[PDB]
Amino acid sequence: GTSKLKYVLQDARFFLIKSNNHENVSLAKAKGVWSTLPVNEKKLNLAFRSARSVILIFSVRESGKFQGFARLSSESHHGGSPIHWVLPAGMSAKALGGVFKIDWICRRELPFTKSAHLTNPWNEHKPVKIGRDGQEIELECGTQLCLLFPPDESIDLYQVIHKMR
Template sequence: MLTEINPPTDTRYFIVKSFNHDNVIHAQRDGIWATQEKNAEMFSEAFNTARDVILIFSVNKSGKFQGYARMESAPGTAEMPLWTKGLLWQSSGAFYIRWITICDVGFYHLAKLLNRMNEDQPVFIGRDGQEIDPETGAKLCSIVDEGRIQ
C-alpha cells in the first residue's frame, strides 16, 4: 500500500519496462531486478539521495502496469537473476526490490494522469528508466493500490 512509503517529497518514481511477463514474474518471486546499463547511474543516484525509490513495472506492449516495488539496494548489489542470461543488452547489475503492490492496471485508466517530467505526456508513455514527477507517481501508485485489475 502507498501508506507504507514516505511522502512524495522524499520519494522518486521511475517506470521500469520489461521485455516479457516472465521476467516480471521472476522479479516478483525473487525480489531481484536488473535493468539496462544506461539506467545504473540514475538509479544509484536516486537510491543514494531519496528516502524511497519506487519502480513502477510495465511489460512492453501489454497496455498495463503490473504493479510497483521499492528499491532495497543499489544496482550491482545482488546476484544476477537467471533470466538475465543471454540478454542482448548490457545490465546495470542486479539489485534487490520489495514489491508493494502487484496488480494489473490498464493504461486507459491513466489517460488524464500526466507526467511533468516527460513533457506532460500521459504517465504510461515513457522509456525504461523514465522518471515520473512525485505527485503523479504517488497518484499512479494509489490507483494501482485500488486494485483495478484489467
Template sequence: MQQWLTGSSGTRYFIIKSWNHENVEASQREGTWATQPHNVDTLVEAFKTCRNVILVFSVNKSMAFQGYARMESLPGTAPEPAWVKNLRWPSSPPFYIRWITIANTRFSRVGHLKNALNENLAVLVGRDGQEIEQNCGASLCELIDEERNQVF
C-alpha cells in the first residue's frame, strides 16, 4: 500500500468518470487527462492546497473502477490528448497525471464503502468530479491495490 494513502490530511480523492475505456487507456499511456469544465475550480483548489490529489477512474456503465492516478500539474500544462478532439462537449485544459495503480475493480468489491461527502452513499455512486471522504478514498485505493496484487 502507498504510504501517503493513510493518515495524511494532505490528500484528497475524487471520482473521475469517462465515457469509454479508450480514453482511460490513452490516459494510462500518455499520463494526461482533461475533465469537464465544471470540475476545474475544485481540482485547482485541491491541487494548490493539498500534497496529493488522487483521481479514481471509472468508465460509465463498466460497473468497476479502472484504477487511480495522482494529479501532477494544473490544468493547462499538458498537451491536448488526441481523444479530446472526438468529444462532443467542452473539456478543461489538459493536465498531467501519474497512474499509480491500474486494476479493474468491480463495484461489488467496494460497495460497502460509504462516502460521507455524498450523503453516505456507496462510494461507487458519484458523478464526475465527486469528492470522496479521505478515509473512504484511502480504503478504496487499498482495495484497488489488492485487486491488482491478486492478478499477479
C-alpha cells in the first residue's frame, strides 16, 4: 500500500539530484550514500535539520528517467570510507568529500514521460524533470512525483519511520 509512504513524505522537503553517470547512482543504491558539490551540500544539511524528512529524487543525465528516491538519514560527514565515485571532468574527490547517509524508499525507475503533468513552482513552473542538481521541489509537486513511482516491494518503511520522530 501507500499509507506508510505518505506518512514518510508528510511535511517532507524534496530535492532533485542530477547524476552525470549511472555508476554513481548504482553505488548509492548499494551503499546507501550520496555526495554532491559544496553548494548543494550546505543546502541539504540545512534542510535535514528543518524537516521531518528530506527526500532526494535521483535522475541520471540523458537517461530520460528518474532512478528512484531516498531519505537523508544524516547530515554530511567527512573522514570515512572514501567512496569510489566516477568523477565527471573537472570534479575533485575533495569536492564530493561530504558523504550523506541515505535510506532508499524506491529503487525503481520512472520515465520523464510519466511526470509531464507535474511542474515545480520553485523552478518557474517548469516540468519537474527540469532542474539543476540540488533544485528544491515544492511539497505538493514532490509528493505527487514520489507517488508516481512504481511501488518497491523490497523495502519496508517501518525502520525508516522508526528514525523520524
